[PDB]
């Protein structure tokens, strides 16, 4: 949040003169906020539009600013601990399947929005079931791929 201002003339403005000239749409693209109107921006001064103009070299830097070293990309995660995580999530799936069966059974038994409105406390097992996928996937895929590659590139 940035702003840039300059003072309106020291009155002699009972003439009703505009503070500025206009020959473009270019200055009326933005809506002044209520707060500055409270403190009187168009009554005593005026705003001026901020613009950015980056040069070539700094923007070349600015993208590097997050790159991370090649050393890491080829590295494997430990296979132990990894298996532990797999078993954790798979055993977490059960309770959600059990709950899901009831949640399927009971719907349309009442008015439609009164499904959601009565589901603000207890969780809805669909989402928690779904978002444990995208954790077995992604993880298993990328680990198997990385091992499968580097088994060739070194000897």
């Amino acid at each position: 949040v940035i702003d840039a201002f300059r003072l309106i003339n020291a009155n002699m403005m009972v003439l009703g003169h505009e503070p500025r000239q206009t020959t473009s749409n270019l200055g009326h693209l933005n809506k002044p906020s209520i707060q500055a109107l409270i403190h009187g921006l168009n009554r005593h001064y005026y705003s001026i539009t901020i613009n950015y103009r980056k040069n070539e070299l700094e923007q070349k830097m600015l993208l590097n600013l997050h790159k991370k070293s090649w050393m890491e990309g080829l590295t494997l995660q430990d296979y132990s601990e990894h298996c532990k995580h797999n078993e954790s999530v798979v055993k977490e799936m059960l309770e959600l399947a059990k709950n899901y069966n009831k949640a399927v059974e009971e719907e349309d038994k009442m008015t439609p929005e009164q499904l959601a409105i009565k589901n603000v406390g207890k969780q809805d097992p669909k989402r928690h079931l779904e978002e444990h996928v995208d954790v077995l996937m992604t993880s298993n895929i990328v680990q198997c791929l990385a091992a499968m590659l580097d088994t060739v590139v070194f000897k």
């Binding site: 996937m137 895929i141 198997c144 791929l145 499968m148 590659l149 088994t151 060739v152």
Partner: protein, 50 residues
């Protein structure tokens, strides 16, 4: 005629027919290529918009 027609060289009175044909040694490399193809495909048609 059978002997000199088919195999079983009867050297030390032995008629032997090759009936082992094990071959297929530990050959992880052919997996290492085609399985990579396979997994890349799994991830291909998983997030692309259908």
């Amino acid at each position: 005629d059978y002997a000199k027609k088919r195999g079983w060289v009867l050297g030390p009175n032995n008629y032997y027919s090759f009936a082992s044909q094990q071959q297929k040694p530990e050959d992880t490399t052919i997996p290492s290529t085609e399985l990579a193809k396979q997994v890349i495909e799994y991830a291909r048609q998983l997030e692309m918009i259908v």
